Structures are given as structure tokens and as C-alpha cells.
Amino acid sequence: LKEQIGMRALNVAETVASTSLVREAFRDSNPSVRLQPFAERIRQKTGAEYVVIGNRQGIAYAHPLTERIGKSMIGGDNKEVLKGKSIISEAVGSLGPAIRGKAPIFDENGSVIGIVSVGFLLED
Amino acid sequence: TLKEQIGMRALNVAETVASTSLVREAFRDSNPSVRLQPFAERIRQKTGAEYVVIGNRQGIAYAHPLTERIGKSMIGGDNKEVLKGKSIISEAVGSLGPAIRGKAPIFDENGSVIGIVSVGFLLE
């Protein structure tokens, strides 16, 4: 069950990472203008705790707490995602145990330009 | 239950696809399949789904894992609740075995339903 909630998280992250809107926003001077409303819409519709979209350093362009945008970093190891891999991992935050999926964002030439990290609270 | 989580996986992918600007915009095109089919296929591949079918209000498939089925195949199962704006999880069977699927409505800018996304995962 924990594995399938992780697959929920990863499938949402992969779908967000493959959306043209997300890839295109990284060409904007402020990617958050387009990234944050989309991430929030997806977070609401799917029941996720967060849909965080960040650059290669993990700096969040989108975050469920808008005051954290540009300040918070995608938590956990991101080295594998920067290699183009998709990663499921367990984590914890103030709201409790979570499982998250991270997917790379690719440009038109296959380079990783960012990370999508989607987390679900471990709860029925 | 693991089956219920696989159904949430299917529905979360369908909801995320249905919320993308590409999918909402493509329904205005002369041939929506030109933009819908490559996106649906990419999401199908990345998520491990058996199918990401995108259809119109009458259920005609504009994207399908078999390109020869575009236009000929209809989204299977009751769609009446989706046209009412509801998201629905259901079980079905096909040539490849039992599957669980989730259906989400596609909305235009005025909140009218313009189509359906149906995502299916094989129970395996």
C-alpha cells in the first residue's frame, strides 16, 4: 500500500514534469508566475500535501506556502533526479509521515532543468 | 486497500492530464488528436498506464494507445457522471486482463465539460 501511494506521488510528479506549461515556464524571467497556479491546481485536485517544482539546485519555484517560494529547497537527495532518474522516498514533515515521488524536468535537448517533487501524507 | 490506491493512481493521472493547458486548448483545434495523442502517449509511457484515453463529450477517442483506434473507439463504461463534472473510478476488463481506471472531466474556461480523460492500469 505504501508502495502504491509512492506510485501515486511519482505518477503525479512525472505527469507535471512532462506538461508543456512547466517546461516552458523555465524560460520566463520569473517561472513562478506560471508554475505556482498550475502546481496548486494539481495539488488540490490530486489530494497531495505538496507539488513542489524547483530548479536544478532544488530552489522552489512552486510551493504550497507561497511565502516559501524562492527560499525553500526540495528536501532529500536530488542527485539521482539530476541524473534523469525518478525516485520514490519516504519523508516526514510537521504534518506527519509522507511518501514522495521526484521526477526530472527535461528541456528540448534532454538536459535536466528542474525537479518536480510530489508528496502524499501516509493516511487512508 | 491496494486496489483502491491503484484507482486513486489512475484518477490522479487523469485529473492532472485533464488540468493541463495543452489538453484544454486542443479541443479547440480542427484536429485535436494532433496535439492530444503525443501528450497522452508520453504520459502513458511515463506512468506505466495501460491507456490514457482522451475523448469528446460523446466519448469519441481523440487519443488512444492504438492510433488506429482514434475516432473509432469510444471511452468505455458509463460517462454520464463525468459529463456532470464528476470524477469516477471503476473496474473493467480487456484483452490484457483486469484493469482499474479513473475518469476525469476536462473543463473549458467557463467551467463547461468539453471532454473526458480515462486512465487505466492493469491489475498486475
Author numbering:
A (entry chain C): 34 to 157
B (entry chain A): 33 to 156
What does the study report here?
Here, we used solid-state NMR in conjunction with crystallography, solution NMR and distance measurements to investigate the transmembrane signaling mechanism of a paradigmatic citrate sensing membrane embedded HK, CitA. The PASp and PASc domains are connected to the TM2 helix by two linkers: the PASp/TM2-linker and the TM2/PASc-linker (topology and domain organization shown in Fig. 1A).
We used a bilayer-embedded CitA construct, referred to as the CitApc construct, that contains all essential elements for transmembrane signaling (PASp, TM helices and PASc) and the fully functional R93A mutant. Previously, we reported a piston-like motion in the PASp domain along with dynamics changes in the PASc domain of CitA from the thermophilic bacterium Geobacillus thermodenitrificans (GT) upon switching from the free to the bound state by citrate binding.
